[PDB]
Design a binder for this molecule. Structure first.
Ligand SMILES: [Mg+2]
Ligand SMILES: [Mg+2]
Ligand SMILES: [Mg+2]
Ligand SMILES: [Mg+2]
Ligand SMILES: [Mg+2]
Ligand SMILES: [Mg+2]
Ligand SMILES: [Mg+2]
Ligand SMILES: [Mg+2]
Lengths: 52, 63, 225, 240
RNA sequence: CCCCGCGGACGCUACGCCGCGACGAGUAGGAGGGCCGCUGCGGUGAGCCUUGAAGCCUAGGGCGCGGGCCCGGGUGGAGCCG
RNA sequence: GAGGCCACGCGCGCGUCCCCCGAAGAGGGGGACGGCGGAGCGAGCGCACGGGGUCGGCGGCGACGUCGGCU
RNA sequence: CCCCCCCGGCAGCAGCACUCGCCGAAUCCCGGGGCCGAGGGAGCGAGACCCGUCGCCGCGCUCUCCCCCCUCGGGGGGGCC
């Protein structure tokens, strides 16, 4: 089965490797962005609650 | 279940001579090989005529 | 002549390898271009709807030109006209699927076999899953699995279709050679719908499964294969 | 020849490198590493010796077979995988970390609570619920047939001896050389003997595992006890 | 110009062997195959047999989808089978 | 001008476009593209989601009591 | 409490405060259970000889040179126009 076997899918469609690599890189970047943005929101909440 | 009809599955045709003539069978072997290993449709026609029956191989007059 | 014949065979093999490399590069770039085209169409529909809503008007999308048809009823007690139309749609078995190019004639045939089928408008993902997981070619009247691109190229290369991506593009965007590309595909032998059906004996709009569900055919396909 | 380099294409997902073809071309500098152009003796000659035996003899190695069986078996096809067991990757459950208290489920030490030390080369765990506690020596076990509890001791910075390997723990046998038909019983040696080396290793490991066990209250009692299923308790409702 | 090696599996009863794909309800009825079975005749097995044929019996061992068949043990006493 | 991507990577000559001086907006000097032009060749190790399973993994038990025989 | 405001601002956003969708070229990663292992001479090459670790496909390193980080030659990285 392609869609389950990476090398079989690459044999039938070599561009699937670059699509998959771009998807993985994009998802990692977006996950890092969202994690950093949530951490910044939490840090801003901590600052505005304990600003003294 | 599949919606197909099985009454015409088996094609009725000669795959070999019904005769037991050993010389005829030898030259059927020869033309089987030639029809398989050449692209000449003449060999195919000759082989299928060798398979045929006597009524399907009428005599040819000299005239 | 031994050295000369070694040179001859090495040159022939090297030329063959370069030809394969060139064809593989062509396949890769064609798939990239198809990806660009797909995203352009998908964004274009959204953009047209958005500008119509901004102007306060209505954007009516183009009527779908591709359908997926799944035979949902068996082969017992079928009227002759329904039987003939199912044979013309190549649905001779239950849970067989076929892509149909939509026009007046095909739609009227679908109306004839309406109680026996569930059909709809597949999306790009559904076409990809169907061709990749269950795609079989009719090569020399044999059902051959599409395990190599050479199988497609030897049968459809005269039409420009030489790979899985070309076949998927021709099926999805109904091209000039859609008839040839679709008839090359053996009808899809799908499994039973996992999770069951609602009611196969009634129409979809009355709580059943028969007839035209617009785009829920994709849900049916996901459960089906 | 040149020194081997690292892969220069980090793996982000198995089977996919982080960098594309052109990116790896530039990283490898293939634009300047471009190249265009530039056994075993089967027979041995030996002096045969003796007068007028000719000069020497051309003796070939691997003489042709003396006998051929009446029929053979065709060779197999090729499988592009199916690595031997020694080359298999060894997987360990995430709940089994060094120092975890495990529960043995099979064997003569059934139901006993032991201490996990390390996974070996074959994937078998090496455990020693210390012999002074529940009579479990340094012994191999299978991770499939153990239950990893939640209680752990910090067995970092203890020295597991290097010779404690799969070859070390592999079983030894005596039978059967110089003996074909059994008319006199060969039941001798059936009493397995604890080697002095094994005793020394057990003492060395336990002397540095035991103080960490005594560091937390009544863990030694926990290790002395055995696991059992009471009629009210059910393994799927139990947190281990 | 093969030769430090003089070497290199199996096959192809061609009425044989091998590959791939689809298919499998059935009365009346039709056809094919039968190394299914009975009896006798022409050939053939330098076939079997009083150191035990045919037949029969058998909680014995098996083979074949099947028709059926082979072998072990007993009884039997002169013929029998591929 | 203080990042990301590319299945982009030899020369020579030819073409197409862009740039400079342009002393006829001549003639040369530079970039980008090319599917153009008469002349042979990369090999050497590996890893594997790659034309249908292997282990170059292991244990226990075996004669008057037990092992196997789905018939 | 409801509606209009002269107008909103911030955060989040089909919500990891489980109110209400359709989806994936706008989709990827990982894990668990079950059933299965059919096939068996794939070598254009050395003129094979230990049982063809072979074809297609996807990669890594070397036939260039600098460095960096751990071990004590081995391992892991940055590249090098
Ligand atoms: Mg059927
Ligand atoms: Mg019928
Ligand atoms: Mg009915
Ligand atoms: Mg279910
Ligand atoms: Mg009805
Ligand atoms: Mg029938
Ligand atoms: Mg969401
Ligand atoms: Mg097998």
């Amino acid at each position: 089965n392609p869609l389950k076997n990476l090398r079989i899918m690459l044999k039938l469609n070599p561009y699937a490797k670059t699509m998959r690599r771009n998807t993985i890189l994009r998802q990692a970047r977006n996950h890092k962005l969202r994690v950093d943005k949530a951490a910044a929101a939490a840090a801003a909440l901590q600052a505005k609650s304990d600003e003294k | 279940g599949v919606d197909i009809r099985h009454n015409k599955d088996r094609k009725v045709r000669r795959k070999e001579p019904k005769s037991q003539d050993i010389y005829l069978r030898l030259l059927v072997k020869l033309y089987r090989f030639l029809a398989r290993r050449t692209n000449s449709t003449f060999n195919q026609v000759v082989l299928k005529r060798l398979f045929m029956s006597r009524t399907n191989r009428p005599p040819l007059s000299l005239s | 002549n031994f050295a000369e014949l070694k040179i001859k065979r090495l040159r022939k093999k090297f030329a063959q390898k370069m030809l394969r490399k060139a064809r593989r590069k062509l396949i890769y770039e064609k798939a990239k271009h198809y990806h660009k085209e797909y995203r352009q169409m998908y964004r274009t529909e959204i953009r047209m709807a958005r500008m119509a809503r901004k102007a306060g008007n209505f954007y009516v999308p183009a009527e779908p030109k591709l359908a997926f048809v799944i035979r949902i009823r068996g082969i017992n007690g079928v009227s002759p006209k329904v039987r003939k139309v199912l044979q013309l749609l190549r649905l001779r078995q239950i849970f067989n699927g076929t892509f149909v190019k939509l026009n007046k004639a095909s739609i009227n045939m679908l109306r004839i076999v309406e109680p026996y089928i569930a059909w709809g408008y597949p999306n790009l993902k559904s076409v990809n899953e169907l061709i990749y997981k269950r795609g079989y070619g009719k090569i020399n009247k044999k059902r051959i699995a599409l395990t190599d691109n050479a199988l497609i190229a030897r049968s459809l290369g005269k039409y420009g279709i030489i790979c899985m991506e070309d076949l998927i593009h021709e099926i999805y965007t109904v091209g000039k050679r859609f008839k040839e590309a679709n008839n090359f595909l053996w009808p899809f032998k799908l499994s039973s719908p996992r999770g069951g059906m609602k009611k196969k004996t009634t129409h979809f709009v009355e709580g059943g499964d028969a007839g035209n569900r617009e785009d829920q055919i994709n849900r049916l396909i996901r459960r089906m294969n | 020849k040149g020194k081997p380099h690292c892969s220069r294409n980090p793996v982000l997902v198995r089977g996919i490198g982080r960098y594309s073809r052109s990116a790896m071309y530039s990283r490898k500098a293939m634009y300047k590493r471009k190249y265009s152009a530039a056994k075993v003796l089967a027979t041995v000659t030996k002096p045969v010796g003796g007068d007028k035996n000719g000069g020497t003899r051309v003796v070939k190695l691997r003489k042709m077979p003396r006998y051929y069986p009446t029929e053979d078996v065709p060779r197999k096809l090729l499988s592009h995988g199916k690595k031997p067991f020694s080359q298999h990757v060894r997987k360990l459950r995430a709940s089994i970390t060094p120092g975890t208290i495990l529960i043995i489920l099979t064997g003569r030490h059934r139901g006993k609570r032991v201490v996990f030390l390390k996974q070996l080369a074959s994937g078998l765990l090496l455990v020693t619920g210390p012999l002074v506690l529940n009579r479990v020596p340094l012994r191999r076990t299978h991770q499939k047939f153990v239950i990893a509890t939640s209680t752990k001791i910090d067995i970092s910075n203890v020295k597991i001896p290097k010779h404690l390997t799969d070859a070390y723990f592999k079983k030894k046998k005596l039978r059967k050389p110089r003996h074909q038909e059994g008319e006199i019983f060969d039941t001798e040696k059936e009493k397995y003997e604890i080697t002095e080396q094994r005793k020394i290793d057990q003492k060395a490991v336990d002397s540095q595992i035991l103080p960490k066990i005594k560091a937390i209250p009544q863990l030694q009692g926990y290790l002395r006890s055995v696991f059992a299923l009471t009629n009210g308790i059910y393994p799927h409702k139990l947190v281990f």
